[PDB]
Design a binder for this molecule. Structure first.
Ligand SMILES: Nc1ncnc2c1ncn2[C@@H]1O[C@H](COP(=O)(O)OP(=O)(O)OP(=O)(O)O)[C@@H](O)[C@H]1O
Ligand SMILES: Nc1ncnc2c1ncn2[C@@H]1O[C@H](COP(=O)(O)OP(=O)(O)O)[C@@H](O)[C@H]1O
Ligand SMILES: Nc1ncnc2c1ncn2[C@@H]1O[C@H](COP(=O)(O)OP(=O)(O)O)[C@@H](O)[C@H]1O
Ligand SMILES: [Mg+2]
Ligand SMILES: [Mg+2]
Ligand SMILES: [Mg+2]
Lengths: 53, 470, 486, 35, 128, 456, 161, 128
């Protein structure tokens, strides 16, 4: 039973780390997109406020 | 003095054309032919003998060509001991229906900050009776404090508890400035000060002066009411040498008020939509709230943090103007712990072993370290669960939860929110109780024995009662 | 006294649009009729945009503006040591006028490619973590970056206090004159800092340029350049200076205010297009001159406050791109008990070992390698007891070296004692000791080596290295004190 | 990112809170009865 | 009118996000410079001068009252947006309605962990 | 023609010409200055006024100050007399060695070569470096993104590329320090003097330096790349050479363009960049190409803001890169030099139709064996040990000693031909050297040196 | 490409085929070949009868090749046809609009040229009032019923646009 | 010219992302209000008026056709961006080329599960 749970646990934690890394990559892509969009939105707000003068 | 005419009215901004005698910037102008007194503060000279001004009251009913008179000075408010127990608005009018404020001297609400050679380096701990404040980020006599928090985390309750404790223990003419806050809270504070004897409607021994400009005021009044309260406190500090308490709630509104006129004054917006002059306006206001060699001003300022950001330009700019910041957290208030002071985000410049003593400093650092270790262990607890922790780590988590509960405290002003009685814990009792929790002297008692208690003896008694019940 | 003048067309928010002044130069200092000063930043066809060195309530439409004919300059010299001055060099500590003889323009160009030599001499801070892992050299520009209340000003003040051992000695080559520019701070914070420097007797070789929060935006803008000129005076005359801009975020904010009010085109975060140009032309003036130019140097320690650790903001990005490295501070490390809260993984010094003495090089290469391995395997703590003996040894040595880097405030250490302590650390003589005692040991041991072993410390200080005799003597001292330690 | 999992809320932070509360209500029961 | 004549009124603004949008259009067309999200600089004033008129009068003024129940629609649960933060910082408490609670069967989907009443038990019968 | 300064706003100067306006991109000399101040025309504003960006500081400028039209864009001295010198964006010597005495000047603003002057076939630029030539070769006339910064031997690689191209192909090199720190510029100057690439005594220097420092206005840092490109263009078109052009950093080129565009009052695009980002990068990069006379191959140090490859500046630069060379610190910690990451470096011409079927097969085999080795390192059978051994040998053999380092390590400098590289890695893959020890392939040239070193 | 047109054509197939009253389809800023497909499919299904007066569907079309003015007013044209069939005949009308977002989008393209300060996401400041002025005509009254199926494009899958 | 004269032409736009970038440059230099990712409001019309001209004409108009193959370059495989979704809303289907399939050696790297042809299935030969 040991050598069966110490290998099943190893495999389960390997798969958990793989899924976590995949989700991290997806979330990093989303984060970069969102921060670029935030910078652009702030720039557009400042430019539109300055062009109204 | 000089007379001009209104030539433009856009929102809370009014342009006035003077033929003779253009008034300097920051002068107060009175509009002629109005029921109530309307005051316009000059902000810019536009050229062609026209000045842009900000209105201290509403601009409805204003007509182009209406006469405007120059007073020759900035807004002058009455200062003196006659202002104690009274309520005045941004321009110094009494708004308590108790008659005029017959002082003998008036002070302009715009003045220069004290010089560098007028600064005092004295740092002396001000014990408030609150466990978390005195333990981790203690306040100093004559220092600037600042209470940061989002909407609904407990800034007003904490500032009212501070009022209660210190001001009733104080003998130095407190001053409260409501800056763009709820009028309901202003009436509440007024009446809980009357019923507390701090304000006396007869036999004038009142020890608090109130200055109020609330949310329903135009941007100009909400931008200048902080200066009005500051000027009252400044008179009490300089011309009388007294030690003043200065409560301000909320100071963020001051900043916000500026924004609401910035673009109408013809200014390109800066980041997050704030005036380009944010830092310098905050500077010239806050640098007057200070202890000098002529007197002392302890100032508690409630600072609204929009959306729990703390990186928004207003709180981030305020941070560098304070001596002992107390940051309230929503993640802590949702645990049920009050006050919601964040222990790992509050700071005090007198949290120095050479000032508070090595025992106080060591206890504070041990509390902060065990709380940070609890933070670090909660991830392992989420993954593994609790049963697979080391025993040293189960002990760490137990002591950390106990310390979390023990930092909580029942307030005298929150007796309606909790039903509990108010507790005022002395400093040595706080240090001793937290040292005893950190040492392991109470590993056998439950954690709910430390929730909303005063000294540690109350934790022991509460545990004994909780056991005797079940 | 016949002067060329102009009229104030308009005034607002500290910007004066001025008629006339047909011969005023760009960045020329003008004087208003109320005595206030100003700088001509915008030369436009019909007006001049003057920024006001003070409060605009004294300026009215129609006021007379005189020229001065000179770009902004400040007094420089040794007469400024021990003084607190404003951005224009006026004494603000009430100790009388500055009896200086020389004036220097605040906007001079940096030394070129040829007048420089490589950065090779150490600039000792007295902080073990900095001197061992993030070494700073004379002529370098090392950034102190971090969130609020993380211990940056403390690093600057320790570096300033530490130079007392060199400034009280006789070796003129190792003397370092300090300059602390305070931008946008409270006056009471600067008074506390001045009192702290006086108590440590650090004022006699320090200048404090103070442009505080209630000063006009042009003054906060100009203060770093005034301080840099005061330090360039020493850099040009064969001497060595250090300058601390505390901090450059507030100078950027002041410059952005001035630009936005002058209607200059805003960019990202509303900062003007030439804010990088601003900080870069300020920071390229910290150089190391070759012997043909006197051999002097100027070391810059700019400070930057990041919001939530976001080093990808505009001004942090700029100043990180400009400087030669960074000392990063973390608040999580602060509250973990690691103080100074230096993040060794993120901190970097692109000068590196070329700015270290041979002894600190000896012990610090080993310490860096060991702490790197520890950082690699540090996630396996909370499980360390269930891995190899090698992994547990990595974790043990890592935590020992971590506690070895903690240091008290306002107590900078000499390089010899730092080397002795890191020697006791990376040679294994703290593996048998448990972590909760390391700091305590580090204190007691230190006292020991200071009391009965002045010969070894003096020999290391004089040689700069640990020779074989020094190595063996250090060995015996460490093992004896460790065996006889409680 | 020391308390990142429970500061983010979500399933992994709400399960951590539940596990902590379970364990310590158990321990507070077995600590009160022993008083 | 009712508040100043000894009577008690209750008003519901459904909703203030659309009033802020109408005000933003009206201001942008008057060529007033835009602020955050093109909203004018004084949209906080716009809502505060309105929500401050809901008051409880003392007995010298009739004792009447006006209770305000403003409504705010958030985008994808972003209570950190401009107008929601404005109106949250103005009012005396919020009733937070969530979609996850709505679909789990909790109806009305009141999030109690986030719903606040700054008046509290003072506004409550003793039995309740 | 002579005009007069009518406006000075920062680094922007409006100059009014009563007659004969200068065309856009012309250079104007401000008169009456202690040092040379050049203004580059950017717009015609109307009413005989032009807006210009300044190439130096504008302090002390007076409205009405005379300005002289030069009648051409910024002209720099081109020729062999630029080799071993340092010049700035306006072609002035900044190394204090006197005037750069060339016979010809060239404008820094020129057009990309016409469509009929392009080389219709891609070919390899042989660098003599084994890992580069094998796994991620350099196209003759292409753009190479050099990733990795400090502590991985980027300067040694740059100097070795200069030396190898000068020895093998007989072509010179230009180094454009865009946004160069003055400290690191001095360091690089002296590193090049020591390693023999620059020679202050005779005329055998191999590289021409063009520095635009960080303390220069955004216009200077924006045009310094075009200045270096003009020197390289002379060496290609007039000498018929295969020039190398190094650009460090290219992100600083983009940032200088962004700052210049923001100063000219243009509406920023996405993430704050100039609306003309792609066309700025295009009009610069389209001049680095192979003509019918010679070629220019550009190695460009890449910086990725916030480590986001989708940022507009890297994403606009990557559209032009024909190869990628990643210097990794993990490879440097293993003692392998150059520290070129063999699995992360890519090349667009690594294609059997361009490099040949044999070269491509050898490179793919090397890549697969390295991937297999790391997959086996993950867990640490019968042949897994054989792949481990062969991949250790491949790793050791990718390293190579550089000539420009002979004064440090003492060893000799190896310039391995391409055929020798292919043959050596072919033989190691086919199992011809399973008897030699793995330490026999470390820091050698061809495989003959590996067997001669295993003989010891 | 998530299935707005497939769903609106399935709704035309399910509801409009067996419908009692009339029906109006307004193509607003969509594919012209989709309009050709719909026309010939309604002919081959007998719903449009090119030989007599038995047709039951009106068709208005300003598609994605049209300038922004036509794309801004073609939804109003379809509304007008449906309003006639509702008010002046008491009929039960079906009104299919695809795509209504284009209406808003077209406004944006002219809001810049009309000299108006932009709102959030560069949109016309009159976005909500224009949308309301259009949408309040698409309604049921007590003089007749209008069932309206409108396909709404979501830019960049951002539902908070 | 071929579509209207009875002949059949194919046309490749390689690529329309760069045309969108060039048009955004022209728009920002004309000081027109930027929208999503600073693109103008009419960046959709830009591509729609262009790709609508690829058509199949009936026999009364000649019977010629014009087939369009617009190319679009995504960033990190994000096909939910602004210009990708515009061109997806314009064209009659797409061919997704994946980087994961390209690096693994599958070439052409067509994602057969996401690539669709709405109107081409009725044009396939019988044997195919
Ligand atoms: N090595 C240390 N040991 C103990 N405490 C320290 C140490 N360094 C700093 N502190 C304390 O941490 C607090 C913050 O440090 P400090 O004010 O110097 O950093 P800062 O970044 O300049 O803060 P601010 O945001 O106000 O500018 C101080 O109260 C200081 O006493
Ligand atoms: N010390 C406290 N004890 C009990 N409840 C509290 C305490 N502080 C705040 N609260 C609760 O949180 C609510 C918000 O309090 P408040 O002072 O208005 O915060 P803020 O000033 O930041 O808006 C209160 O109505 C109260 O119910
Ligand atoms: N109900 C469906 N069944 C099968 N495929 C569908 C269905 N709806 C959409 N699709 C697929 O998604 C594609 C997009 O269809 P369409 O409705 O024209 O997109 P849009 O949302 O732009 O109107 C279709 O070509 C089809 O391949
Ligand atoms: Mg409150
Ligand atoms: Mg500081
Ligand atoms: Mg569709």
């Amino acid at each position: 039973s040991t050598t069966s749970e110490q290998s099943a646990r190893m495999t389960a934690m390997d798969n958990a780390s793989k899924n976590a890394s995949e989700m991290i990559d997806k979330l990093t892509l989303t984060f970069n997109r969102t921060r670029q969009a935030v910078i652009t939105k702030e720039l557009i707000e400042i430019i539109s406020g300055a062009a109204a003068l | 003095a000089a007379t001009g005419r209104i030539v433009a009215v856009i929102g809370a901004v009014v342009d006035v054309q003077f033929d003779e005698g253009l008034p300097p910037i920051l002068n107060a102008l009175e509009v002629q032919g109005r029921e109530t007194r309307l005051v316009l503060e000059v902000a810019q000279h536009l050229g062609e003998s026209t000045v842009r001004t900000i209105a201290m009251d509403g601009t409805e009913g204003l007509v182009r060509g209406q006469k405007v008179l120059d007073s020759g000075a900035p807004i002058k408010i009455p200062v003196g001991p006659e202002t104690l127990g009274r309520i005045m608005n941004v321009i110094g009018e009494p708004i308590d229906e108790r008659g005029p404020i017959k002082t003998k001297q008036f002070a302009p609400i715009h003045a220069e900050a004290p010089e560098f050679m007028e600064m005092s380096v004295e740092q002396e701990i001000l014990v408030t009776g609150i466990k978390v404040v005195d333990l981790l980020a203690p306040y100093a006599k004559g220092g600037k404090i600042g209470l940061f928090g989002g909407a609904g985390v407990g800034k007003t309750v904490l500032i009212m508890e501070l009022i209660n404790n210190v001001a009733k223990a104080h003998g130095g003419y407190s001053v409260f400035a409501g800056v763009g806050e709820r009028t309901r809270e202003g009436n509440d504070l007024y009446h809980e000060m009357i019923e507390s004897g701090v304000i006396n409607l007869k036999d004038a021994t009142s020890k608090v002066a109130l200055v109020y400009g609330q949310m329903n005021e135009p941007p100009g009044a909400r931008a200048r009411v902080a200066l009005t309260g500051l000027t009252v406190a400044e008179y009490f500090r300089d011309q009388e040498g007294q030690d003043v308490l200065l409560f301000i709630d909320n100071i963020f509104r001051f900043t916000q008020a500026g924004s609401e006129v910035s673009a109408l004054l013809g200014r390109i917006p800066s980041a997050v939509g704030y005036q380009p002059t944010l830092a310098t306006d905050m500077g010239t206001m806050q640098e007057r709230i200070t202890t000098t060699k002529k007197g002392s001003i302890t100032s508690v300022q409630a600072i609204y943090v929009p959306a729990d950001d703390l990186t928004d330009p207003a709180p981030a700019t305020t941070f560098a103007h304070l001596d002992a910041t107390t940051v309230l957290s929503r993640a802590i208030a949702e645990l049920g712990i009050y006050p919601a002071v964040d222990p790992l985000d509050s700071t005090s410049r007198i949290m120095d072993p050479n000032i508070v003593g090595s025992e106080h400093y060591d206890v504070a650092r041990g509390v902060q370290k065990i709380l940070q270790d609890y933070k670090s262990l909660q991830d392992i607890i989420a993954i593994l669960g609790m049963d697979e922790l080391s025993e040293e780590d189960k002990l760490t988590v137990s002591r950390a939860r106990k310390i979390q509960r023990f930092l909580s405290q029942p307030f005298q002003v929150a007796e309606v929110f909790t039903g509990h009685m108010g507790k005022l814990v002395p400093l040595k009792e706080t240090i001793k109780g937290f040292q005893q929790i950190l040492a392991g002297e109470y590993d056998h008692l439950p954690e709910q024995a430390f929730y909303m208690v005063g000294p540690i003896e109350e934790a022991v008694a509460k545990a004994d009662k909780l056991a005797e019940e079940h | 006294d016949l002067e060329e003048t102009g009229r104030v067309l308009s005034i607002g928010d500290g910007i004066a649009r001025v008629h006339g002044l047909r011969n005023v130069q760009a960045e020329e200092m003008v004087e208003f009729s109320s005595g206030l000063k100003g700088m001509s930043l915008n030369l436009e066809p019909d007006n001049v945009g003057v920024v006001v060195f003070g409060n605009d309530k004294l300026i009215k439409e129609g006021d007379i503006v005189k020229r001065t004919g000179a770009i902004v300059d400040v007094p420089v010299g040794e007469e400024l040591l021990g003084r607190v001055v404003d951005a224009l060099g006026n004494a603000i500590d009430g100790k009388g006028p500055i009896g200086s003889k020389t004036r220097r323009r605040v906007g001079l160009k940096a030394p070129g490619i040829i007048p420089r030599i490589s950065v090779r001499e150490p600039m000792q801070t007295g902080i073990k973590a900095v001197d061992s892992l993030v070494p700073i050299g004379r002529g370098q520009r090392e950034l102190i970056i971090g969130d609020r209340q993380t211990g940056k000003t403390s690093i600057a003040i320790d570096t300033i206090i530490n130079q007392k051992r060199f400034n009280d000695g006789s070796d003129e080559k190792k003397k370092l004159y300090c300059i602390y520019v305070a931008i946008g701070q409270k006056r009471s914070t600067v008074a506390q800092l001045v009192k702290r420097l006086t108590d440590a007797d650090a004022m006699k070789y320090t200048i404090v340029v103070s442009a505080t929060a209630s000063d006009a935006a042009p003054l906060q803008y100009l203060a770093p350049y005034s301080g840099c000129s005061m330090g360039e005076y020493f850099r040009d005359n064969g001497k060595h200076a250090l300058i601390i801009y505390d901090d450059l975020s507030k100078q950027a904010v002041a410059y952005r205010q001035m630009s936005l009010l002058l209607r200059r085109p805003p960019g990202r975060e509303a900062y003007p297009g030439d804010v990088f140009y601003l900080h870069s032309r300020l920071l390229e003036r910290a150089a190391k001159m070759n012997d043909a130019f006197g051999g002097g140097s100027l070391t810059a320690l700019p400070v930057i406050e990041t919001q939530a650790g976001d080093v990808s903001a505009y001004i942090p990005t700029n100043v990180i791109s400009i400087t030669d490295g960074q000392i990063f501070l973390e608040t999580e490390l602060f509250y973990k008990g690691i103080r100074p809260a230096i993040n060794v993984g993120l901190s970097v010094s692109r000068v590196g070992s070329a700015a270290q003495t041979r002894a600190m090089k000896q012990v610090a290469g080993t310490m860096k390698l060991e702490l790197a391995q520890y950082r690699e395997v540090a996630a396996f703590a909370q499980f360390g007891s269930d891995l190899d003996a090698a992994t547990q040894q990595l974790l043990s040595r890592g935590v020992r070296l971590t506690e070895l880097l903690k240091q008290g405030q306002y107590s900078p250490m000499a390089i010899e004692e730092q080397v002795a302590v890191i020697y006791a650390g990376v040679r294994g003589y703290l593996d048998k000791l448990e972590p909760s005692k390391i700091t305590k040991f580090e204190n007691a041991f230190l006292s020991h080596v200071v009391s009965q072993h002045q010969a070894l410390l003096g020999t290391i200080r004089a040689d700069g290295k640990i020779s074989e005799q020094s190595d063996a003597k250090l060995k015996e001292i460490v093992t004896n004190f460790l065996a006889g330690f409680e | 990112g020391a308390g990142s999992i429970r500061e983010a809320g979500g399933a992994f932070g709400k399960r951590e809170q539940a596990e902590e509360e379970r364990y310590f209500r158990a321990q507070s029961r077995e600590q009160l009865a022993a008083l």
